[PDB]
């Protein structure tokens, strides 16, 4: 009776599992670590903070190592419910890290949105929005304090913390450019919101303080850090109207070993819109009613999962004249590649192809060395934009090779690649090892 | 004395701040070279 | 209509002679500095 | 508080009803510490 009845029922087929065992995991031994403390310290912003303005913040050297950095904004909403869509990261137009004069990385607002949509998942993603959007149908005039955590190579991985105690000779700083227009806060569509408040920004950095022997070791020894970079050059789409299946051949200007190639298609006017607009509930302003229009999204629901409103038909990557893998349909890059590699759900309009087994992981697991490829081209075939977006009968019931007529608004082509590089810290001076 | 020192509220002995120079030193340079052209790099001499 | 304040922070510098600057740069120093300790709290003032 | 007859004419243990607004308690201490400076590095000898 009980568990003893299967323990005695022992034989040869058990040896591969329990014969001459190596571990018992009911006695877990935890490894003793190095004494440290975490502190949040406010930084001082250089330059006037404002819409369309660029400011810089130099990180005050109060502690030994840097891990996360969170940008704090105070925003007042100029619209009502459903008029905003992650406005905090739209405002944070771009950020770059400069170590002693050498730039390491450059992130853009639509990257932050892509990353959140592609790699951050479950409750975490929802909480991210809580920190970056208004999610409980708040009304006009509401004030909210927003937080946009940064995702550079050291921000979310303690193991890659920036070793300030070992950069005795270099300045470490971030540059911040804030967007000129934020939907529902400064502009509603392309129309200015009269009386809109100017959001206030503060940049906070979380410091790690080390004990006696480890601080000495970090300060006096050289370091080899494996770091991540974001590569980006923007382009334009070729989205057709009727009877033509467009195809683009975008030669990539990426360098170095990367983890993946990711892209989306954007409506430059409506931040975060990666799909067509259609008279489907939750897809457009007034959707489902006589006031419905397909020229204006229901901004609080800008992102969707209905691939029918997607613009991409099929794609492949070609290297040096030869195919990298066989042609796959657009739905393959939106749902299957992230299933096989990230483990989350990717919304419609965001597409991923990985070169790595764990592209979401910090541990290197495969790559693509673009600096050794003569011609890397991304081939994108588009859907025919013949569906009348105003008729749910046509939007919810048509073939796989067609999309909405309103897809022609996704005129910006955003292709990103995420890199590997090495950050060398020697005699208090930092710089990256590999050029290009 | 009614009490002995409990050991509470101790201090760090001779704590130094972060070693930070005011020199903003030259960005360290890359170890490799800018990659050029693999098929026709450095130019091809053309005969007269 | 209240205007924003304009602030300018001025610092008084001491320039010393060459021999004393040498001593300051080379030698260890200990300064018996003063600190201020403060936390805010609340008091219970009676009525009647 | 509005009647000088009481405010200027009462005893040591009695004050005005308006004293009840002095609700913020501010307690300051001034102490020594030592600033130790050696070869370009400095810090508090007794740090917290």
């Amino acid at each position: 009776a009980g568990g003893l009845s299967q323990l005695v029922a022992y034989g040869a087929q058990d040896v591969y599992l329990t014969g001459n065992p190596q571990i018992t995991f009911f006695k877990t031994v935890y490894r003793r670590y190095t004494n440290f403390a975490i502190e949040s310290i406010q930084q001082t912003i250089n330059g006037s903070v404002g819409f369309g303005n660029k400011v810089s913040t130099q990180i005050s050297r109060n502690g030994d190592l840097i891990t996360d950095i969170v940008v704090e904004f105070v925003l007042t909403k100029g619209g009502n419910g459903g008029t905003t869509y992650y406005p905090a990261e739209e405002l944070l137009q771009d950020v770059e890290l400069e170590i002693g004069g050498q730039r390491i990385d450059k992130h853009y607002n639509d990257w932050f949105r892509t990353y959140d949509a592609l790699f951050r998942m479950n409750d975490d993603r929802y909480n991210y929005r809580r920190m970056t959007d208004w999610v409980n149908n708040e009304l006009v005039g509401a004030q909210k304090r927003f937080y946009v955590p940064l995702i550079f190579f050291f921000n979310q991985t303690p193991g890659l913390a920036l070793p300030l105690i070992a950069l005795q000779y270099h300045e470490v700083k971030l540059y911040f450019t804030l967007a000129s227009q934020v939907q529902g806060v400064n502009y509603n569509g392309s129309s200015a919101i009269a009386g809109a408040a100017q959001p206030t920004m503060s940049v906070w950095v979380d410091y790690i303080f080390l004990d006696t022997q480890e601080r000495t070791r970090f300060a006096q020894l050289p370091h080899e850090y494996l770091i991540e970079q974001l590569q980006f050059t923007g382009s334009e789409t070729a989205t057709p109207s009727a009877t033509t299946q467009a195809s683009q051949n975008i030669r990539l200007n990426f360098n170095h070993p990367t983890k993946y190639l990711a892209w989306n298609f954007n409506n430059p006017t409506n931040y975060g819109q990666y799909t067509a607009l259609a008279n489907i509930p939750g897809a457009c302003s007034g959707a489902g009613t006589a006031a419905a229009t397909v020229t204006t999204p229901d901004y609080g629901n800008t992102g969707t999962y209905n691939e029918q409103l997607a613009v991409l038909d099929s794609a492949k990557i070609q290297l040096n004249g030869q195919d990298r893998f066989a042609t796959r349909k657009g739905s393959y890059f939106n749902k299957v590649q992230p299933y096989q590699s990230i483990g989350g759900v990717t919304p419609a309009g965001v597409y991923l192809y990985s070169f790595a087994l764990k592209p979401a992981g910090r541990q290197p697991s495969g790559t693509c060395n673009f600096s050794r490829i003569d011609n890397a081209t991304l081939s994108l075939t588009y859907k025919t934009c013949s569906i009348d977006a105003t008729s749910p009968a046509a939007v919810l019931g048509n073939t796989e090779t067609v999309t909405a007529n309103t897809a022609t608004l996704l005129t910006a082509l955003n292709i990103y690649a995420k890199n590997y590089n090495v950050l060398r810290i020697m005699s208090g001076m930092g710089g990256l090892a590999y050029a290009n | 004395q009614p009490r002995g020192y409990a050991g509470l509220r101790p201090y760090e002995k001779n704590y130094e701040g972060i070693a930070e120079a005011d020199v903003s030193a030259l960005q360290a340079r890359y170890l490799d070279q800018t990659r050029g052209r693999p098929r026709t790099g450095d130019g091809d001499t053309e005969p007269i | 209509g209240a205007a924003q304040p304009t602030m300018s922070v001025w610092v008084d510098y001491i320039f010393l002679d060459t021999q004393e600057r040498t001593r300051f740069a080379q030698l260890p120093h200990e300064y018996l500095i003063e600190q201020l300790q403060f936390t805010g709290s609340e008091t219970a003032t009676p009525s009647a | 508080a509005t009647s000088p007859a009481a405010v200027l004419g009462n005893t040591e243990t009695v004050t005005a009803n308006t004293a009840t607004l002095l609700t913020a308690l501010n307690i300051y201490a001034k102490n020594y510490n030592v600033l130790r400076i050696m070869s370009g590095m400095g810090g508090l000898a007794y740090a917290n």
């Binding site: 000779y169 | 972060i18 360290a28 | - | 050696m38």
Partner: peptide, 25 residues
């Protein structure tokens, strides 16, 4: 003559990044 946090000792490299000096003029 130096506290440890000041710098990693310079050796086994020759980028010629930093100057030698007396530190007083």
């Amino acid at each position: 003559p130096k506290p440890s946090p000041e710098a990693a000792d310079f050796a086994q490299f020759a980028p010629k990044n930093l100057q030698a000096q007396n530190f007083l003029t």
